[PDB]
Design an enzyme around this catalytic site. Structure first.
Site, PDB file in Angstrom:
ATOM      1  N   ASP A   1      -4.593   2.488  -4.598  1.00 26.00           N
ATOM      2  CA  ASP A   1      -3.203   2.450  -4.155  1.00 26.00           C
ATOM      3  C   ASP A   1      -2.824   1.150  -3.432  1.00 26.00           C
ATOM      4  O   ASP A   1      -1.681   0.995  -3.003  1.00 26.00           O
ATOM      5  CB  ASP A   1      -2.923   3.635  -3.226  1.00 26.00           C
ATOM      6  CG  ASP A   1      -3.632   3.507  -1.877  1.00 26.00           C
ATOM      7  OD1 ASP A   1      -3.035   3.924  -0.860  1.00 26.00           O
ATOM      8  OD2 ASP A   1      -4.770   2.979  -1.821  1.00 26.00           O
TER       9      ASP A   1
ATOM     10  N   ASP B   1       0.823  -1.206   0.000  1.00 26.39           N
ATOM     11  CA  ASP B   1       0.000   0.000   0.000  1.00 26.39           C
ATOM     12  C   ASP B   1       0.858   1.258   0.000  1.00 26.39           C
ATOM     13  O   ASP B   1       1.818   1.357   0.759  1.00 26.39           O
ATOM     14  CB  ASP B   1      -0.914  -0.034   1.235  1.00 26.39           C
ATOM     15  CG  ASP B   1      -1.855   1.160   1.329  1.00 26.39           C
ATOM     16  OD1 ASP B   1      -1.391   2.254   1.707  1.00 26.39           O
ATOM     17  OD2 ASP B   1      -3.071   0.989   1.081  1.00 26.39           O
ATOM     18  N   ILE B   2       0.499   2.217  -0.849  1.00 24.96           N
ATOM     19  CA  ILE B   2       1.229   3.473  -0.949  1.00 24.96           C
ATOM     20  C   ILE B   2       0.872   4.403   0.215  1.00 24.96           C
ATOM     21  O   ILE B   2      -0.288   4.491   0.606  1.00 24.96           O
ATOM     22  CB  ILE B   2       0.930   4.168  -2.300  1.00 24.96           C
ATOM     23  CG1 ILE B   2       1.393   3.273  -3.455  1.00 24.96           C
ATOM     24  CG2 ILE B   2       1.604   5.531  -2.374  1.00 24.96           C
ATOM     25  CD1 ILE B   2       1.115   3.825  -4.839  1.00 24.96           C
TER      26      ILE B   2
HETATM   27 MG   LIG Z   1      -2.270   4.290   1.002  1.00 29.01          MG
HETATM   28 MG   LIG Z   2      -5.366   2.825   0.742  1.00 29.02          MG
END
Ligand SMILES: [Mg+2]
Ligand SMILES: [Mg+2]
Ligand SMILES: Nc1nc2c(ncn2[C@@H]2O[C@H](COP(=O)(O)OP(=O)(O)OP(O)(O)=S)[C@@H](O)[C@H]2O)c(=O)[nH]1
Ligand SMILES: C=C[C@@]1(C)CC(=O)[C@]2(O)[C@@]3(C)[C@@H](O)CCC(C)(C)[C@@H]3[C@H](O)[C@H](OC(C)=O)[C@@]2(C)O1
Ligand SMILES: [Cl-]
Ligand SMILES: [Cl-]
Ligand SMILES: [Mg+2]
Lengths: 328, 189, 190
Positions: free
Chosen positions: B64, B20-21
């Site tokens: 993301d 996850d970003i």
């Molecule tokens: Mg994120």
């Molecule tokens: Mg997220």
């Protein structure tokens, strides 16, 4: 071959009791149930005592002395792990013999009291002993609330049965769904005798009506369109007792009863009072009216007059069930 | 048929990885909707390449959030290793894109191993997916992970046969779920 | 490939109580019976897409027990689709109520709706999965994640367009939304 039976019904209808008979019939140990029997006992006496002053009109004690015993019971009521001293049984026993307390017992449909109340209160001298051994009937009467799902496996003539027991109270019904798929048949249990009582959940909705509404939602459920229902019209002993007692009229709870006449095809037991015959069949028909109104060919409803704490009757009715399951 | 047909099946001994970003909503607010998509397509295309090699099966992309599973569709005892390797290649891929694009993209990696149900749900827009407490946990590992590092559970460590040097993760202190579930976590060196 | 958009209405409809309904036991086949019920729910929501009044609603995907959709991808007769999204939300509620009646449950929906510029296409390298991206999509999601059971939370911009269509709104107030900061939001009146 393996058959999966799902027990459904409102709370306190007798579902767990049916499963208990399956063990007795087809399957350190029972010493753990002693505490549970003792809890039912304490629960029964404290409920009747605490209910006396709140009733309208209020029921008074027949003996002044017993007021002190009333004070004693209410003072130990909320105690967590109760030690059950010999004093407790003497107090319980004394109170149960006071006619005022009994008058309050006869009005128990006006409040919430467990079914095994009279059975245990009449056996205090037996339960109090140190060397007490719970009989089979004692284990069948013991009441403990069902939360979650429980699977009980057994065999009858080399044929396998998987029976699922579930909680019947409102908040517990949300789990039923987890047993709908691939179900051989449903066994719906109903407390035929609870026609003059209301459910615990809200203290207003009539018990039988709740069972009736619950049946309608099962019978007409979208996921059980082709699933048959074996209907256990339970608590026949208590129904008969109430009917013959004549104090709580069925037509004062279900007005339609006043139009009802015993069917021609009716098959009463030997020496059965026509008044009891009439009541038990009326209750049966109220459920059939629902099953008659829909499904047609897809699934069927098989009723049975039952008494879950009576091992003879359950052997008899479950054998009738085996014939229903195998024939189709 | 009472219930619609369910296209789902159970699979034990599987490893789930979550990437996850960081600060995605923040990041998307600054740069153009056009460039965000280019930076993300660049990143996820590479991830999808690294996945086929490392024997991982990519599941979905949730804006993301990127997740894949090793040990599917056919059983593989090399599973925990694949996901760990997949994260290794992932972190490095993000580093190249960080410099090449000049964008502040950082990811946290979470890995757990256990059983998962996989398949599809519904009638329309079928997309292969996985569900289970183990998958739920794997998700929380990413949430309780650390920037640019691979956060794994005790379960994943037992399938790694001691081939990677780890350090105490302390996941219980960065995520309420890991703590309340008494989960022992480790960060890969 | 990819195409840019100017006015798309995104919607996130969650069922926050599902996570708690979900359990793994030998009796429920390790959660399979719970996934079966979710399959019925998602399927019931899908059948709405076949309604003529919903021909403009495009299901994007499902995130767990959450439903994601959008309108205006087929492009105030210009702002009509925003009102169609809200109607779609009410319809999901009707379907979820139906499910409750039969499964003896009480699941409630929590909806978040927003509109604005998005980018439609496919990213990655394995399978052709259509998706939409953008700040607009992020805020729509926050409208759900910070919403209330049985309510449709919408942004200020959305509440305005909804007002010109006949819908009435109630100000939820200014809430600090993660990544965005102080956003004034609204609840669509029923
Ligand atoms: Mg994120
Ligand atoms: Mg997220
Ligand atoms: N007299 C009499 N008592 C019965 C009969 N069937 C059940 N009972 C008693 O009623 C009580 C409630 O039965 P039980 O089987 O525990 O209910 P349940 O349906 O399992 O209840 P729940 O788990 O949904 S809350 C028990 O004390 C049981 O012994 C019956 O036919 N006659
Ligand atoms: C369906 C139920 C259950 C428990 C199953 C499951 O594993 C999940 O679907 C995952 C973890 C899992 O499917 C992986 C994707 C994602 C999006 C991370 C899911 C959500 O967090 C779900 O919760 C929500 C909030 O929808 C969750 C947790 O829901
Ligand atoms: Cl009942
Ligand atoms: Cl017998
Ligand atoms: Mg029970």
């Amino acid at each position: 071959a393996t058959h999966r039976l799902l027990l459904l019904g409102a709370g306190e209808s007798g579902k767990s009791t049916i499963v208990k008979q399956m063990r007795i019939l087809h399957v350190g140990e029972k010493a753990t149930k002693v505490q549970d029997i003792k809890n039912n006992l304490k629960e029964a006496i404290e409920t009747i005592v605490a209910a006396m002053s709140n009733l309208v009109p209020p029921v008074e004690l027949a003996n002044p002395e017993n007021q002190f015993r009333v004070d004693y019971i209410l003072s130990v009521m909320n105690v967590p792990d109760f030690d059950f001293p010999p004093e407790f049984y003497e107090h319980a026993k004394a109170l149960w013999e006071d006619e005022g307390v009994r008058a309050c017992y006869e009005r128990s449909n006006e409040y919430q009291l467990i079914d095994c109340a009279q059975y245990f209160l009449d056996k205090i001298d037996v339960i109090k002993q140190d060397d007490y051994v719970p009989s089979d009937q004692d284990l069948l009467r013991c009441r403990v609330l069902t939360s979650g799902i429980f699977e009980t496996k057994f065999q009858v003539d080399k044929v396998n049965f998987h029976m699922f027991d579930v909680g019947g109270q409102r908040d517990e019904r949300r789990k039923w769904i987890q047993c709908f798929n691939d179900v051989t048949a449903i066994i719906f249990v109903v407390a035929s005798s609870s026609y003059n009582m209301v459910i615990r959940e809200d203290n207003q909705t009539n018990r039988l009506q709740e069972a009736l509404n619950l049946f309608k939602s099962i019978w007409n459920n979208r996921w059980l369109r082709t699933i048959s229902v074996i209907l256990f019209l339970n608590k026949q002993d208590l129904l008969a007792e109430k009917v013959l007692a004549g104090k709580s009229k069925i037509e004062d709870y279900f007005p339609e009863f006043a139009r009802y006449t015993t069917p021609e095809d009716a098959t009463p037991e030997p020496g059965e009072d026509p008044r009891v015959t009439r009541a038990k069949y009326f209750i049966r028909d109220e459920f059939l009216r629902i099953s008659t109104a829909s499904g047609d060919g897809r699934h069927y409803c098989y009723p049975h007059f039952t008494c879950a704490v009576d091992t003879e009757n359950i052997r008899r009715v479950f054998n009738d069930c085996r014939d229903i399951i195998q024939r189709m | 048929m009472m219930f619609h047909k369910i296209y789902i099946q159970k699979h034990d001994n599987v490893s789930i990885l979550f990437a996850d970003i960081e600060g995605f909503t923040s990041l998307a607010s600054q740069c153009t909707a056009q460039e965000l998509v280019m930076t993300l397509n660049e990143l996820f295309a590479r991830f999808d390449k690294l996945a086929a090699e490392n024997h991982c099966l990519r599941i979905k992309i949730l804006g993301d959030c990127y997740y894949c599973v090793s040990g599917l569709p056919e059983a593989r005892a090399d599973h925990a290793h694949c996901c760990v390797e997949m994260g290794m290649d992932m972190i490095e891929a993000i580093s190249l894109v960080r410099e090449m694009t000049g964008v502040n993209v950082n990811m946290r990696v979470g890995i757990h191993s256990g059983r998962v149900h996989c398949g599809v749900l519904g009638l329309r827009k079928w997309q292969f997916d996985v569900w289970s407490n183990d998958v739920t946990l794997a998700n929380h590992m990413e949430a309780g992970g650390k920037a640019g590092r691979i956060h794994i559970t005790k379960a994943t460590l037992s399938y790694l046969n001691g081939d990677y040097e780890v350090e105490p993760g302390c996941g219980g202190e960065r995520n309420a779920y890991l703590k309340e579930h008494s989960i022992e976590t480790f960060l890969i060196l | 490939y990819h195409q840019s958009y100017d006015c798309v209405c995104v919607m996130f409809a969650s069922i926050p109580d599902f996570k708690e309904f979900y359990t793994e036991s030998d009796v429920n086949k390790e959660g399979l019976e719970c996934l079966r019920l979710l399959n019925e729910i998602i399927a019931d929501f899908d059948d709405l897409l076949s309604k003529p009044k919903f021909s403009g609603v495009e299901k994007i995907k499902t995130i767990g027990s959450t439903y994601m959709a959008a309108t205006g991808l087929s492009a105030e007769r210009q702002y009509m689709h925003i009102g169609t999204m809200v109607e779609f939300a009410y319809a999901l509620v009707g379907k979820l109520d139906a499910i409750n009646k039969h499964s003896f449950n009480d699941f409630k929906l929590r909806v978040g709706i927003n509109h604005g510029p998005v980018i439609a296409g496919v990213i990655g390298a394995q399978k052709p999965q259509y998706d939409i991206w953008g700040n607009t999509v992020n805020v729509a999601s926050r409208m759900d994640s910070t919403g209330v059971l049985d309510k449709i939370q919408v942004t200020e911009e959305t509440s305005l367009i909804l007002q010109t269509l006949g819908y009435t709104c109630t100000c939820r107030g200014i809430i600090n939304v993660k990544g965005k900061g102080d956003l004034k939001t609204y609840f669509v009146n029923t």
